[PDB]
Design a protein around this ligand. Structure first.
Ligand code: NI
Ligand code: NI
Lengths: 122, 100, 570
């Protein structure tokens, strides 16, 4: 039986990520002329201004993709992504300075986003 | 000679590769450190010969085969990396899965 | 969304139920539990999770539950379990074993394991992390021995010596107040934890005791200084007052007594019995019978580990050359023949496997290899699995039981025996962050990175002039923890309570962390984790056969070992 030093023998099955959290599918479009790549754990409403999508649907959420991976949008590309819910205290500070507190303050987050030109606020 | 730190360290790779080649020439299946040394010194000497980085990335996958080395050695070596002075200055060569 | 297990393990290291081979042995360890929250794993890099506002908290100051260092995704192999967790370090100590990141947005974050602005990250995904090895049989003979120990994952050296003096070349002894003070001063420049043993010899208390008061952390009784009933007795009286351990290399020659006389001098008091099998030294031929007693903490040294086809030949000659024996003088050969025994060495493999010998050690440069304590521990476990089959107590196909029994021999048990397990010897919260990362392919052979007091001290790393650190030649190198004044904060000098109370550190200008030796007179064999068996060991005086519970303990020597010619250049 051929020995590969330090090899894994993984169990059977699959690992479900972000289990028991609500999922949401939204369409997003890169309206800019340069590539945008978005990581798994960035508060989705605070992504680059040029990404057009329903900003309200990004609040309190992030990409539902394996921890440490990212979704890529080429210049002009539109595609669907799936989001999952933030966890913990469901508070976000810094990043684009749109939340700085609870993600429950949707009107305040959307006001700041609209005033600063983050595309896609109603 | 004006040897700098890297020049002297790298002399030891050459030496380890000479040692390993002698071992291979008397019939032995090479181990991990021996295989790494032979492929590393091959790359450095290929840079000194004026080959390109792209040539060495191809050639590096054919220096040693699985029957040259002990069981499991192919799978221990995911890549081999070496920096050497090409005709155009220092460059990095990475040989992916050199032995299969 | 789901990730298949192979992919999961490649990205984040293995998770519950997954198994990992140790080097090129036949031994398999299985993840028992996992502290993560699937999907909120911590990781570091471009577009990765530990970034401000995300898995890194951008609000808290260092004092507000933020770590100095997070080791992400470690597979911990320890006496306390074999399991997956993040490891959080702060002020040089392990403060949290659990799940690290940011409570803002992640579930399941251990409260004092916040990754903040103050946090450094070490990616342990795909690595096995263990405590630093505790070697309690060190001869301080050549300072080049320290890197040799660090490269095989040893982080604490307990022993004695003044360099290549004949006293120190034979015995783990730094004799008397002045030698002890000089070697404490020397110890300021060694990038490893150290504890110094004084000469456990004398017939009056004062000469012995003054060594402990000067800064020794314990004592060594060795036959080359006279391992007599008096020296045994006085050392143990000093030890019991001072709260330090005594190691013994007994009277091989049976000059003043046989094993039963040494046991009667000990009189039920706690003692560490070095190289208990006896090829390293001890009453011929039955010293290994010490390992059945409740008040003995038994260790092996490493050249007999495990029993191989070259073992006897190499020992017979080693013994002859270091004692200047002559194959011409019959007594010399009867002596060698009484000391180097296939019967006791074979049985030492099996006593390790049964939990009867609790500890491993090197005997570095006196009759043992400084960089092979960890190495030979696993080679022994592998040989025993092949010859004795998995222990009854095992699970799936895991070798988890044996692995915890054997990791315990060179981590927690030596620490317990020497009165220093409050500081070192295991990956537990509240203990010093002496941590070894291993690639599974190199497990127990060559350490990836050795962390000392929360800063890397030693690493296998490549060309310093390159664009990246991985290009050849990759070799063991001292890291920034060893440089300048940082060598003081990342290493511990372990000393007696009386030398610390008397202000020896200040008298000598010692800048290293000072660790207190304590709680070593009220322990026994029952305190040796996973290796706590007491029994009647019988060693036949004529044939040297070893019996335990009426059964002969025998096994064959092997021609080949794993963790050997696949790895080493020489
Ligand atoms: Ni000894
Ligand atoms: Ni010794």
């Amino acid at each position: 039986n051929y020995i590969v030093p330090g090899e894994y023998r993984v169990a059977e099955g699959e690992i479900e990520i972000n289990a028991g959290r609500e999922k949401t599918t939204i369409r997003v479009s890169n309206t800019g002329d340069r590539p945008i790549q978005v990581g798994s754990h960035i508060h989705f409403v605070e992504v680059n201004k040029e990404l057009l999508f329903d900003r309200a649907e990004g609040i309190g959420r992030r990409l539902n993709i394996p921890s440490g991976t990212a979704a890529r949008f080429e210049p002009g590309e539109e595609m669907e992504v799936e989001l999952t819910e933030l966890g913990g205290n469901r508070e976000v500070f810094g990043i684009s300075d749109l939340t700085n507190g609870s993600v429950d303050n949707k009107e305040l987050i959307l006001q700041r986003a609209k005033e600063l030109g983050y595309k896609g606020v109603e | 000679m004006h040897l700098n730190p890297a020049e002297k360290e790298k002399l030891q790779i050459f030496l380890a590769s000479e040692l390993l080649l002698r071992r291979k020439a008397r019939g032995l299946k090479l181990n991990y450190p021996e295989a790494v040394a032979i492929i590393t010194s091959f790359i450095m000497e290929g840079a000194r010969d004026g080959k390109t980085v792209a040539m060495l990335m191809e050639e590096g996958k054919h220096v040693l085969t699985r029957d040259d080395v002990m069981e499991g050695v192919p799978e221990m070596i995911d890549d081999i990396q070496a920096e050497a002075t090409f005709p155009d200055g220092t460059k990095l060569v990475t040989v992916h899965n050199p032995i299969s | 969304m789901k990730i298949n297990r192979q992919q999961y393990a490649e990205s984040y290291g293995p998770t519950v139920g997954d198994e990992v081979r140790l080097a090129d042995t036949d031994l398999w360890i299985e993840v028992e539990k996992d502290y993560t929250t699937y999907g909120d794993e911590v990781n570091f890099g471009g577009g990765k999770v530990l970034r401000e506002g995300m898995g890194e908290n951008g609000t808290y100051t260092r004092t507000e539950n933020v770590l100095d260092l997070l080791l992400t995704n470690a597979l911990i192999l320890d006496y306390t379990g074999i399991y997956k967790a993040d490891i959080g370090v702060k002020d040089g100590y392990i403060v949290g074993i659990g799940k690290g990141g940011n409570p803002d947005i992640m579930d399941g974050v251990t409260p004092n394991m916040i990754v903040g602005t103050a946090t450094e990250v070490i990616a342990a995904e795909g690595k096995i992390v263990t405590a630093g090895g505790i070697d309690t049989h060190v001869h301080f003979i050549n300072p080049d021995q320290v890197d040799v120990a660090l490269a095989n994952g040893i982080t604490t050296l307990f022993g004695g010596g003044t360099g290549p003096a004949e006293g120190s070349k034979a015995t783990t002894v730094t004799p008397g107040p002045w030698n002890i003070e000089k070697m404490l001063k020397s110890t300021e420049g060694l990038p490893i934890n150290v504890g110094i043993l004084g000469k456990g010899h004398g017939s009056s208390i004062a000469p012995i005791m003054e060594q402990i008061d000067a800064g020794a952390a314990g004592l060594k009784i060795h036959e080359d200084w006279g391992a007599t009933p008096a020296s045994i007795d006085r050392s143990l009286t000093v030890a019991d007052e001072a709260d330090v351990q005594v190691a013994i290399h007994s009277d091989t020659l049976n000059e003043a007594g046989f094993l039963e006389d040494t046991l009667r001098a000990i009189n039920g008091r706690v003692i560490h019995s070095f190289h208990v099998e006896g090829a390293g030294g001890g009453h011929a031929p039955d010293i290994m019978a010490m390992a059945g007693h409740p008040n003995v903490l038994p260790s092996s040294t490493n050249p007999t580990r495990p029993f191989t086809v070259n073992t006897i030949d190499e020992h017979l000659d080693m013994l002859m050359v270091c004692h200047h024996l002559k194959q011409n003088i019959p007594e010399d050969v009867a002596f060698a023949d009484s000391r180097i025994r296939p019967e006791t060495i074979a049985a030492e493999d099996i006593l390790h496997d049964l939990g009867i010998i609790s500890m491993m050690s090197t005997d570095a440069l006196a009759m043992g290899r400084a960089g092979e304590m960890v190495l030979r521990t696993w080679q022994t476990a592998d040989k025993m699995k092949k010859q004795r089959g998995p222990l009854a107590e095992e699970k799936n196909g895991s070798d988890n039981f044996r692995l915890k029994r054997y990791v315990s021999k060179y981590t927690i048990n030596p620490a317990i025996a020497q009165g220093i397990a409050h500081e070192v010897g295991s990956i537990e919260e509240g203990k010093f962050a002496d941590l070894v990362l291993w690639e599974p392919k190199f497990f127990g052979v060559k350490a990836d990175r050795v962390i000392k007091g929360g800063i890397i001290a030693y690493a296998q790393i490549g060309d310093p002039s390159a664009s990246i650190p991985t290009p050849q030649p990759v070799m063991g190198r001292r890291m920034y923890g060893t440089v300048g004044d940082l060598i003081h904060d990342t290493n511990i000098t372990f000393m007696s309570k009386s030398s610390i109370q008397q202000g020896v550190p200040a008298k000598l200008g010692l800048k290293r962390r000072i660790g207190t030796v304590k709680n070593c007179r009220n322990i026994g064999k029952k305190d040796m984790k996973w290796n706590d068996v007491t029994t009647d060991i019988d060693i036949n005086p004529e044939t040297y056969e070893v019996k335990v519970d009426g059964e002969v303990l025998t096994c064959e020597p092997v021609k080949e070992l794993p963790m050997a010619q696949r790895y080493f250049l020489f």
